[PDB]
Symmetry: D2
Subunit: 345 residues, 4 copies
């Protein structure tokens, strides 16, 4: 009754399939999906052994989502049919201390209740239609291009959160290091320019990507090679960086992060590369904080979208069809996407 | 020409000795020492191999210091002879971004210039007289008992700093875990009660010390045994603690710290136990920050002293003479001091 | 079909009346009311001319509310019948930037939509039953006495908000002035002791109330007479107070507030006494901020309730019956309530 | 023995005069002045009646100052002869809580001690040489053009301070209104773009100045006429601005400020136009804070200078000679300076 992209066999690839069109239960909303982002966390999931995977088969993929409100469920009010909306992804219980703050990303009782985001447990966005649990997980778009902006629901939000979190320890005139100019990283760079006073240093591996980073306003773009630590030291007295945003998060990049963060600095480990930064005396410098943030707050999403409208940040997009989505995943794992892959069905 | 307590042979014990009385150079001040604190960092130094030790022999010990201003050096103004003052210990360059903020503890150029605190590089406080480099490293006492308060220069300041740093992520009504109710820990407990809204949980090993902790306003005092993680979980939904202050900082206590900090929480690794908390995804929880703070800011010292005057915090003191100082160090390493050892010469 | 306290004639007194028992529409909840607070804002409303009054006649009064969940409306989930809950009063649209943050008190689109709190536009709490618009405006009590705590929904929340807002400019060891030790003021005092490091100075007019203030932990209790400014100056060098909380907010108390706030200080004008503080150069001191806060955030309510459970704050209550409510209002305007008047039906 | 610009007769104009070249006392430094800013506060002073003026005659003017260190005073170390430095102007006692923080602008004991800034009490910068009281009031320039940057010591610092102070209540994607695009205002605009996520709205009276404002990155430039309030309302839903920076501060501009600040917003009254914003219930909106900041912190100066080096902000300068300084003051009061008047002797 509708088409969708699903993960169905452990270790297998994602398939386009036919499945029922869902109806909105009470309190719920269904969207006609205008755009759908592909994130490298979607990759990480599909290469897990059968034992570590916990989202059930089948699973409709894709947790960056925008659309137009197709049908309203029982009792729902707040949004009309026809409204352009983005999906706030990191769903939570709505009532705990964090949720009440808007920070459903840090919900203290969601693992317990088995609340899961769309595309990471609940039916996701890579489909012609998707359901959203509740009205508070929708954010108005007005007249922002869904394709241009949908990726801000994660690729923007997540580093924005991490950056906004870091401005306490990142004074204007400071220096910030972004490791990885990928989907998040390339937005991370723009955001850092928009709202910190920092001198942004980007690091990636392909020159392709360094040029993009520099084009997106990075004051410096460097290879994350064995000379990277030295150059950053050079560029910052011998003081190091006030903030470091590791959007790779592997043991190598984390090691780099430790060796360059300044006294009293901060490291946001944003990417999931399987590493851990050993934080402590004579490991991390004095006053140096370390954190593995996760996604962002409800308000923070609205703030990122408001920045898009202002023209202070954008997603570099590479467009695909619903059918091309499996190919786009192969491109993403190959590392030959420029920015964000966005599927339009 | 005056008596003092010094460290002179690697691996040896501290000796009372006769040495010259120092004169204040230009910009400097000499104090007639009214009280002098003994900290377990003084211990840590003296058990280092010859290669890792870098403060020179001989070294006058003691970095908690108060007194009356004996003689003024050339050109000095700001304080008169006769003024009761405490010593702000973590000396810095005075001009960098941190120093200008008052945070000479996080001075970016002090290792370079070879600036060292009194008792950890420069002549310390365990003497009849000591020199202070500059007037900005003195804080008025008015009429606070030097013996009662001197330890607030470190035993208070350091956890105060760490606590004040944590209140962002420690909401009133939250829960805070203090591992170690020693010199710092027993002040840490009082401070947490004074200025957080938290339910303080203390952890130590002797029942002696738990009783003191509970007497000093800890809502709970627990053994840091293998049931400690469970009890903390029990006491906090299954949510864990918003803040954890490890005043031991060994690999065991750090492991405990990781297993009990809440989603979005913070761990201040205050003690130097040789461990490191492996911070990262699936190691630390989501949003969980980790930090190894060091001492505190100039303003923060004045704030702690203002709390003493208000009667909102005190040091439990165990008094000694200059001659008894070697014995007091043995007691401290034995772990049979109640609070802080303060020498009066 | 049920009894309630209502305001029905402009310039008239509140009457106990019989009215229909309400049923919960979809998304709504009905409570069996266990306790109901009386606030001096309820007074302010009833002495307005016909033209300035805008809540309609009749109006069920009372915006401090607790109870047990009687009946669930269509589609509602989140809370069961039988759950002990408090009402978060300052209702908002739920979707704007403020609301998403939890700060429905500062909702940017609520005047437009005509959203009104219970007891200040919607049917209130002084009844055997009341309706709440949505589940997010309920907060679990667990096993807190509804009578002991209900007033924390406003009498606690409002000054807590104002205090928490002020801690940026109120360092531990500072001085805070609370003008008015009434319903809010007497909780304000306790909160200031719980979570600031401040030396609290209370000011009222009856010695009755000063004694209560001092009993509740005020370091000083003074008459708000013509010597009040002088004494505060005396007590704080000649520096004045870092924070001032005017819980009266009349032109006299506001004038006092201006003349005693310190350089870089803050004034929270909490009470509605018809005055305005003229903020500006050579009126307010340099760096001195001034604000008229309103109520508090959703999370902030939960935080205050968590403080009650911890035993760090309580409401001094004076109990009444539903029938005695008109008399209790007369007592409140007469200024001969000790703390908060709470009606139990 | 050297030339200087002085104010010598009440109600009279500033004269170029010959006076002794000063020698540095102990702790002091003398600068060979490379550039010297002219601020409209220099104007405000000279039009005061004899009774309200308190800086003595004669007075060397000019409180924006840069130079090269000519001669060192007794005992001074920290800076060598030949070092390029800027002067941190708002001198304070160095020891109080504020000063220790770096915030000598909010020094609690400076009026008492009669400490006065250069150009506003002490010999100023409009001379061939000037003295600075102490080394901590100098900030390294490295190789920034003194003429290009000197005005950042006030024209930058002051609004930077006010802006940095406001970012709590100014979320990215918000809207900020800068009233007055003059000396401060034109830097204010750039700073707001550098480090807030805000949509900047500038307001001035000459189209000349609006064009400059828009050229300097203002998203909108409007006449501060009777339609100004309406347009701002239009541009921001009907919500108003999160932040408003009144760099005029007259009763008219303050009235505008009140009528456009949003619920929960902030107004920084930066300019000295003789007005006062009546802050209170039904005057200012709910949660709306109001403040008259003064200058900035020591660290904040270094941060602004670091932004200059980064190329994120600059002063639009109009250069003059020492002799032309009286004419430049006439131009400034006439309102026909474009940016900042900087004298080079
Ligand atoms: N914390 C969270 O909540 C969260 C949310 C979303 C994504 N993520 C994670 O962030 C990471 C990046 O996601 P993405 O969508 O940007 O992926 P992406 O494939 O779009 O981009 C990855 C980028 O990192 C670069 N890179 C790889 N190794 C590097 C190294 N050693 N040094 C420097 N650069 C290197 C690649 O060349 C590429 O530019 C992933 O691990 C993903 O799981 C985390
Ligand atoms: N970060 C800094 O700048 C800084 C400053 C001063 C001191 N310190 C460090 O803080 C630590 C404590 O200093 P102190 O002066 O309080 O020492 P102390 O000897 O006075 O107190 C130590 C306390 O920890 C307890 N303890 C030991 N092992 C424990 C465990 N596994 N679980 C729970 N409690 C345990 C002891 O019984 C004792 O009560 C030291 O390592 C010291 O070096 C750090
Ligand atoms: N900002 C908000 O959202 C908000 C919320 C609730 C209440 N309020 C306001 O707070 C104020 C107090 O409310 P309440 O319930 O505590 O009233 P209350 O009658 O319980 O207490 C008022 C107290 O102020 C004292 N007082 C009166 N004049 C004084 C003066 N000149 N100096 C010092 N003390 C004086 C009285 O003796 C009494 O102790 C009211 O104006 C109310 O409208 C504001
Ligand atoms: N708070 C402080 O510490 C501090 C420090 C320095 C200067 N100031 C004050 O800031 C103000 C501005 O200083 P400046 O050096 O930029 O002066 P300036 O003469 O360089 O600029 C003033 C600008 O305001 C504009 N203006 C005048 N009336 C206006 C109105 N009604 N609406 C909009 N714009 C208007 C003028 O056209 C001009 O562009 C002065 O009052 C000065 O005293 C305050
Ligand atoms: Zn993702
Ligand atoms: Zn939750
Ligand atoms: Zn120590
Ligand atoms: Zn330094
Ligand atoms: Zn009320
Ligand atoms: Zn709202
Ligand atoms: Zn000026
Ligand atoms: Zn001072």
């Amino acid at each position: 009754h509708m088409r969708a992209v699903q993960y169905r066999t452990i270790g297998g690839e994602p398939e386009v399939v036919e499945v029922p069109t869902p109806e909105p239960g009470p309190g719920q909303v269904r969207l006609r999906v205008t755009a759908a982002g592909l994130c490298h966390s979607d990759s990480f999931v599909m290469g897990l052994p059968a034992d570590q995977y916990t989202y059930g088969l089948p699973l409709t993929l894709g947790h960056e989502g925008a659309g137009v409100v197709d049908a309203l469920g029982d009792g729902v009010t707040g949004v009309s049919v026809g409204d352009a909306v983005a999906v706030y992804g990191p769903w939570g219980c709505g009532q705990c201390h964090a949720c009440a703050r808007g920070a459903e990303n840090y919900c203290t009782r969601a693992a317990e209740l088995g609340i899961q985001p769309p595309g990471l447990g609940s039916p996701g966005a890579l489909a012609e239609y998707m359901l959203v649990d509740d009205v508070r997980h929708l954010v108005p778009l007005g007249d922002l291009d869904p394709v241009a902006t949908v990726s801000l629901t994660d690729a923007g939000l997540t580093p924005y959160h991490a950056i906004k979190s870091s401005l306490g320890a990142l004074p204007p005139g400071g220096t910030a290091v972004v490791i990885g100019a990928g989907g998040l990283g390339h937005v991370a760079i723009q955001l850092l320019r928009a709202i910190s006073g920092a001198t942004v240093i980007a690091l990636d591996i392909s020159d392709e990507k360094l040029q993009l980073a520099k084009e997106l306003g990075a004051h410096h773009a460097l290879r994350s090679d064995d000379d990277a630590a030295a150059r950053i030291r050079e560029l910052t007295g011998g003081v190091g960086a006030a903030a470091v945003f590791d959007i790779v998060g592997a043991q190598a990049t984390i090691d780099l992060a430790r060796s360059v963060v300044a006294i009293g600095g901060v490291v946001q480990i944003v990417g999931i590369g399987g590493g851990t930064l050993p934080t402590g005396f004579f490991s991390t410098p004095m006053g140096a904080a370390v954190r593995a943030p996760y996604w962002g707050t409800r308000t923070e999403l609205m703030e990122v979208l408001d920045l898009a409208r202002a023209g202070a940040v954008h997603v570099e997009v590479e467009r695909f069809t619903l059918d091309q989505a499996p190919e786009a995943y192969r491109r993403l794992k190959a590392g030959t996407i420029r920015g964000r892959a966005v599927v339009v069905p």
